[PDB]
Design a protein around this ligand. Structure first.
Ligand SMILES: Nc1ccn([C@@H]2O[C@H](COS(=O)(=O)NC(=O)[C@@H](N)CO)[C@@H](O)[C@H]2O)c(=O)n1
Ligand SMILES: Nc1ccn([C@@H]2O[C@H](COS(=O)(=O)NC(=O)[C@@H](N)CO)[C@@H](O)[C@H]2O)c(=O)n1
Ligand code: NA
Ligand code: NA
Lengths: 377, 422
């Protein structure tokens, strides 16, 4: 949610800033509900309608965010590594993995339908090695505290991070009789960020850094029909930060660097994109996407999204900290970033590390997790 | 599913064996459906003989220049009744098929006959429960000390029977699951698998959770799509890898291991991590040659015990009696770990031989080398182990006087130098 004072004192400036995202602020309804409540007080229903409107408003993009309409207006800020030149015809992860039944889409389809995967033996072990390396890296070197969370949440947690009320269709819901319904988490951002909801933290507690390795579940309601790039279920190592508002934009640079370090250590060439106003997610003020080189596609493909949410989720969660200067409980800033989506890292590893015979070289950092295996197949 | 020829021809012997589980087979309905089938079949055979003869008589009556109208009318009526006889036979078979899907497995002859859990026998025990020189604390008191085990934030997120773990306790829980998968893949001959955690109904019918135990599952309703269910155990996804297949006898045994979260509606243990809606479990599954399955069960049980022995957790092995078994099991061994604050052993694993019961439901077969004909395989599953319950056991058995937790030896390589928690 946006600062309600801003939606009252500066309605035109807020609408002009939101217009860069392609969002049309209903200035007419707000000016009317403000004129209605002012008449009723002079002489709960009028607040209830405004609250639902306020919960449907995307975050204000930060001033440094490039103004654009779509993904074509996203800006490459930097790159790392040289995409490999292969001395043979490049295979995709599907062809590589299906050769010994170690990556199996057909058995997964027989079990669960489309957008599911079965991994076996060394490919299953490589996927597990990737998630373990990621969580070990962030806990040892990047200052994140590990967390195991529920993968099923109720509606208030999703509303806290912004998936509810507007994006229900993107979630898998478990309808329960005489109980509140549950939703499968689309990301550990939901469970991790909500740890601090309804609380007044000590300034000394900041920054709060969390990391969780969880499965992620998305209906994918709204491309990538072949392979495991866009699955209903995927593992992801999520980084979440609860920070002092004055530090959040510096925290985004550090968070993005944390995600980048995973790719650098795996020696996976990538690029960093600053998302334009018209391509960013609902709850973000500023986003950097990491896109890994995919040899069979001859392009970079998204593997991480690192965002600063400012006070947007904190306002929905009523997550505060006691400001050391004023003594006043003030909203915190929240940030989240993939470090990384594990299934997409497995795609990047299989493809970038393939050899002429169709075998796969094991990345150096993953060899301690591969029980002696150095070449797959 | 039991052998359908066995249920239909010997309802009395099948009923007597199921009576040991306390289950009352509807022999009267099975026999009444069988009498109806026989009656319809005899009528259809008599009608086929009649119709085929009248159809041939038409040609003969034509040769004599006679009126074929009475014969044509007989043939038409007889054929219409045969089509009905066929729909009747299909509906009878459909009813018997639905009934046979609700029958528990036949217990093996070696299973002690008993009505309840009091007839369960202790097979053996390993290790000695520690005598503490101080008042023992339960896992809730131990984990809550620094907020590293937090049910309060979990309830705020998801309601009751959920947990949040943080820092060294979250690390310890991950270390346990990693140790378990590494052990089974390296020493016990299991092939690792990552599986879907959401499955459609046929997979749950294949292992036996469907059609009878739908209420125990979390379901995701989907508009103009097959519904999805959250897996209650990796037994569901792993065992169904071989559904609809005719395996080479050389591929047997197929041994699978998976570390997955497990989701149960749980439709007891209100405080704590013992009975959660979500829990991690390292599942062991075997697809075996029917002649080797009971020996396979002994080995499967030993693979699960090895986790407890290596973690130095005192435990007990119980052979479940006829009246205390799971729906799809012919024989089960339960492992019970020592829980200091409860002053008793608590269930941590169930290792079962399913015989050919799940294999029949999923048509998981193998080509027999002697006959060359496809035959049903046997399936087995066992917890190696339920990760949340092992964590409960580690926190309580390894607790120190100050409330700190000593890290088990085998877990220190996964704990990044941490030897004592808190
Ligand atoms: N079905 C899918 C959908 C997405 N992903 C991968 O998850 C990343 C994070 O998702 S996010 O939606 O872009 N942001 C988040 O969830 C934030 N919590 C930060 O992680 C994407 O950048 C993509 O690489 C996938 O692998 N399969
Ligand atoms: N809510 C719950 C329910 C159960 N459990 C633990 O799962 C084990 C296996 O479950 S089973 O139902 O007994 N058999 C199976 O699922 C088989 N696939 C073999 O693994 C139990 O022995 C108990 O220790 C828990 O931790 N939390
Ligand atoms: Na994204
Ligand atoms: Na059990």
């Amino acid at each position: 949610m946006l600062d309600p004072k801003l939606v009252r004192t500066q309605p035109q400036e807020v609408a002009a800033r939101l217009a860069t995202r392609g969002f049309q602020l209903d200035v007419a309804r707000i000016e009317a509900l403000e004129e209605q409540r002012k008449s009723v007080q002079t002489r709960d229903a009028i607040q209830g309608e405004l609250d639902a409107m306020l919960l449907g408003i995307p975050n204000l993009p930060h001033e440094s965010v490039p103004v654009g309409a779509d993904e074509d207006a996203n800006v490459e800020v930097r790159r790392w590594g040289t995409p490999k030149t292969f001395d043979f015809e490049v295979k995709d992860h599907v062809a590589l993995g299906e050769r010994h039944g170690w990556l199996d889409f057909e058995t997964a389809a027989k079990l669960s339908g489309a957008r599911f995967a079965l991994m076996r033996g060394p490919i299953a072990r490589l996927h597990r090695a990737l998630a373990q390396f990621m969580i070990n890296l962030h806990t040892a070197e990047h200052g994140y505290e590990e967390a195991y969370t529920p993968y099923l949440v109720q509606a208030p947690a999703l509303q806290g991070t912004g998936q509810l009320p507007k994006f229900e269709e993107d979630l898998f819901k478990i309808g329960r009789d005489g109980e509140a319904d549950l939703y499968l988490i689309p990301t550990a951002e939901v469970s991790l960020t909500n740890i601090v909801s309804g609380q007044i933290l000590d300034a000394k507690q900041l920054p709060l850094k969390f990391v969780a390795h969880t499965p992620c579940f998305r209906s994918e309601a709204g491309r990538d029909t072949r392979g495991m790039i866009r699955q209903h279920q995927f593992d992801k190592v999520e980084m979440v930060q609860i920070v002092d508002p004055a530090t959040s934009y510096e925290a985004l640079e550090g968070l993005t660097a944390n995600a980048e370090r995973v790719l650098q250590l795996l020696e996976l060439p990538y690029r960093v994109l600053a998302l334009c106003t018209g391509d960013m997610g609902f709850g973000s003020t500023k986003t950097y996407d990491l896109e890994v080189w995919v040899p069979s596609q001859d392009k970079y493909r998204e593997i991480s999204s690192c965002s600063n949410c400012g006070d947007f989720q904190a306002r929905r969660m009523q997550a505060r900290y006691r400001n050391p200067e004023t003594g006043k409980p003030e909203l915190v800033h929240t940030l989240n970033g993939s470090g990384l989506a594990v299934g997409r890292t497995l795609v990047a590893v299989l493809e970038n590390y393939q050899q002429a015979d169709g075998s796969i070289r094991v990345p150096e950092v993953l060899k301690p997790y591969m029980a002696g295996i150095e070449v797959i197949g």
